[PDB]
Amino acid sequence: DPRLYFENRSKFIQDQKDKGINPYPHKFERTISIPEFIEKYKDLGNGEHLEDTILNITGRIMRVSQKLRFFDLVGDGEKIQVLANYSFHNHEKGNFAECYDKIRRGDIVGIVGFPGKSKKGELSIFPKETILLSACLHMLPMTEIRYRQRYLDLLINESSRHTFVTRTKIINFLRNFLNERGFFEVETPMMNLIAGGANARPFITHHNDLDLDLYLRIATELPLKMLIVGGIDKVYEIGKVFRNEGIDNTHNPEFTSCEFYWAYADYNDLIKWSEDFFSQLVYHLFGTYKISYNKDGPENQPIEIDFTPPYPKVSIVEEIEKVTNTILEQPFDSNETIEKMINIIKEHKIELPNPPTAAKLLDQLASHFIENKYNDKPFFIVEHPQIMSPLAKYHRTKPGLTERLEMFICGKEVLNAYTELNDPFKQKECFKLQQKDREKGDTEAAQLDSAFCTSLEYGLPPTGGLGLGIDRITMFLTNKNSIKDVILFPTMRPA
Amino acid sequence: VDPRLYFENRSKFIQDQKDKGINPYPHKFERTISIPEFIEKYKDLGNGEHLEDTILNITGRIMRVSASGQKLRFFDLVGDGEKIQVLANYSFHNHEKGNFAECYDKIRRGDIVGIVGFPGKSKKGELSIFPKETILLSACLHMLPMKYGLKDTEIRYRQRYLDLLINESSRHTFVTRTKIINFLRNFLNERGFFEVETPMMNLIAGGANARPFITHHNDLDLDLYLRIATELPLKMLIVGGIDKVYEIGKVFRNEGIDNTHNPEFTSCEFYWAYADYNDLIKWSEDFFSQLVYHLFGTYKISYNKDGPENQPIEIDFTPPYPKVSIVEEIEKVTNTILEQPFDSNETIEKMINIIKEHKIELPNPPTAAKLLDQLASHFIENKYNDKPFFIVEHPQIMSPLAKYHRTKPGLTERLEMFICGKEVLNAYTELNDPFKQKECFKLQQKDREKGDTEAAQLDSAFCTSLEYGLPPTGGLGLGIDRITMFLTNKNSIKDVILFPTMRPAN
Ligand SMILES: O=C(NCC1CCCCC1)c1cc(=O)c2ccccc2o1
Ligand SMILES: O=C(NCC1CCCCC1)c1cc(=O)c2ccccc2o1
Ligand SMILES: N[C@@H](CCCC[NH3+])C(=O)O
Ligand SMILES: N[C@@H](CCCC[NH3+])C(=O)O
Ligand SMILES: [Co+2]
Ligand SMILES: [Co+2]
């Protein structure tokens, strides 16, 4: 019974206290970490002892096994054995049995001792003195607990640490990749008067002193472009954005994105950037371009994803048309075209979007016909209609379309990029269209950001911009089917 | 000369260019060299020297327009904070692309252009691009304000891009900000620390004494608080065995704006298992000294504490830095004895009287913690100006998350570093006894009931995590913005935040 175990440990602490002992000492000066210990002494011979090498080492006890006490000691994801021998015990410090009888699995300890190997060749610390540094009062397990008590996940599941180490490696790699190419990292506000730069529902909060409602950012696009106007010609931000919508395996309402803006680049530069970056990232982590991924569960058959460039480009209107044996004529929001798309939707028994605006219909069609086209490789969906893409520049040869690219891995979007719309005339127009779409009941529609439009009037150079979803990328590169598995503290309802 | 009319004429110009079949916003210009690279490559040409067979593509923003008769047009071209001259000579113009004068007459200050041309120096020895063809890439439709015409205005903060374009020091300030953060991240990574991200939205806002922002997730039907600190989940990661962990990112404090307060700001917090107070002081002295030396090549900086028009003072970041015990110091400068418990009637009355006589604001409610805090802020925090210093050994009632001092009853092992009277750093040996932790939370709660809306609220998830064993640990926080203010010579936090928090424009 856990409750009783805990009661007993609490009374152990209190009893230690009454008897004038400090069960939470302030400082233990260790001389070596456990990984460093393993590195330095793993070449010892069986039974060999370095008894004149006195070391101070700390760690968490994870195993407890009568003049010979055995323990497993863990630190920084690595483990050594603790071999307490009566014959080595410093008797001046207290009773051997009393000392080691008190130790429980989970306890954090400080050890003064020497390095050796057991006769069986197990690398070990041989204590002359062991000190309790911090007691574990519950029973450590030997579920939702992983997400609510991530510290348990990290202590017991060795794979957890590796997953988050990989996450941090991915972000380090991205930062270095951008910095080596002359990009300048900035911070832009997380609280805005207006939430823009994407089509999503915002979080709203309130500043008391200004008596002002503020929106948490849904993207970093607009202030970054404003910085390009300011002459920071290669600029980027890695940080949190917030989207007030439901939780599922590929959606957390706060997630980490990276956006960069690259003056004098366009669509083609961005496609090349994407292929270079993903192929190089994957090679950096694996030394190969092919990884395996369990798209449908940890014990079902994995598929192989090949990150060898180049990647397929699939124009969205043309592909929808081709797989529906239909023709979707412009204006895409004409009665005939809207009717046609609605009919395609109802015919294939897929959810009719509410409201059924042209953009929402197109997006639904793409979702159901295109986005799962390839699973064995990343691919781009390209040349999105202008009505789906209010911030992307019109396509230089294809009326009605834009110079946009979205990259997908196993049917999930991880990347969105385009040649940037930089004519303020056209931008105000796009904002008007977006708003009349909000008037139809579309609550994810873009609102007019006058500060941003004003900045366009001062001259935005031709520019290419790109956004990455760090969490989804991490999912694919650590073999997780749920985004909860790559965020340390995913958003959950109180227990 | 009217800006409105200027803008109307410019917009009409765009429309007419389109009508005449010209695209005034080209999709792609493929340049072959940047302006800094052009300067590096060709700055050593002799006067009057032309490299007329070296044809280059270059882009930039026009920042000056001048002419000389019919066949000479002069411009200043800027990019990446550096500047070259454009010398458009009729002699070199590619007449196949259009009329020379018509082409260059259209160009205005602020226009972004693409130039096909050759490098050279004028006979006066100005480094120049000599266009054969100049292409408009993006028009500036407003009149750009000129240098020093952008002072004493909010324009800098609402239209940061104008600040960046026009005031050269601006770029430098924000570059230095990014260099400081790079330096910090590298400093920690080289010492074995592991960078993580913890949630910005939480069921409870803990880890500091501050009023939070509140928001709402619709789908879970759930109120959430923006984080006021990163302390609690990072300590939970220490429990989890990530023994050197840190985060650099935004935190949110729902309070008023002034020269050292923006409602969102950037902090770094790190947690260091098996370290304590003394390690934290050393880390601080090492970090600040090495940072300053890395940016300046010296340990001493000048700082216009009182604005650009009054004399600067000099700050010496040469370690070590003075340590000042808070209670002993308040006692010493007020001729008082502040006996424990600090919340005792006698002691509270003593502090209320000290505050009354020195004519300083009385906190509401007058809890012992807030009184001591007010006394400290009035009497200690400006003890030194020519060097950073630490205030140390804060009472436990001021310090709900800090471990009791190992030899001094009622105190904690805490340190705060101040530069010119401003806190930039808060650190301590971490409280890792869950029993004591719940005690401190209950005390805080009783302060909350008595009107202190900044009191620490109980975080059961955190306390429960302490029950699994938090090793002895040292923790530390830095205010990136304030640090940057001191290292870029700014008196206002708005000057080091690209887009500081503001009310809506007209
Ligand atoms: O990774 C995500 N998206 C991929 C995007 C990210 C922004 C930059 C373009 C690529 C992503 C991740 C999410 O967790 C998420 C949650 C709610 C709504 C949308 C969400 O999107
Ligand atoms: O830099 C600031 N404080 C220094 C602290 C920051 C957290 C880590 C310890 C050091 C700071 C900066 C602010 O802008 C600010 C705004 C509102 C309330 C408090 C604010 O504090
Ligand atoms: N803001 C975009 C990413 C950048 C698109 C290119 N300007 C998004 O959230 O999808
Ligand atoms: N959370 C602290 C910084 C770290 C203190 C050491 N645990 C603050 O906001 O001041
Ligand atoms: Co989509
Ligand atoms: Co204070």
Residue numbers in the entry:
A (entry chain A): 79 to 143, 147 to 223, 230 to 582
B (entry chain B): 78 to 583
Q: What do the study authors state?
A:
Aminoacyl-tRNA synthetases catalyze aminoacylation of tRNAs with their cognate amino acids in two stages. First, the amino acid is activated by ATP to yield the AMP-activated amino acid, with loss of pyrophosphate, followed by transfer of the amino acid onto the tRNA. Malaria parasite genomes encode two different lysyl-tRNA synthetases (KRSs) that play a role in translation in either the cytoplasm (PfKRS1) or in the apicoplast (PfKRS2), while Cryptosporidium parasites and humans encode one copy. We present a selective inhibitor of both Plasmodium and Cryptosporidium lysyl-tRNA synthetase capable of clearing parasites from mouse models of malaria and cryptosporidiosis infection.
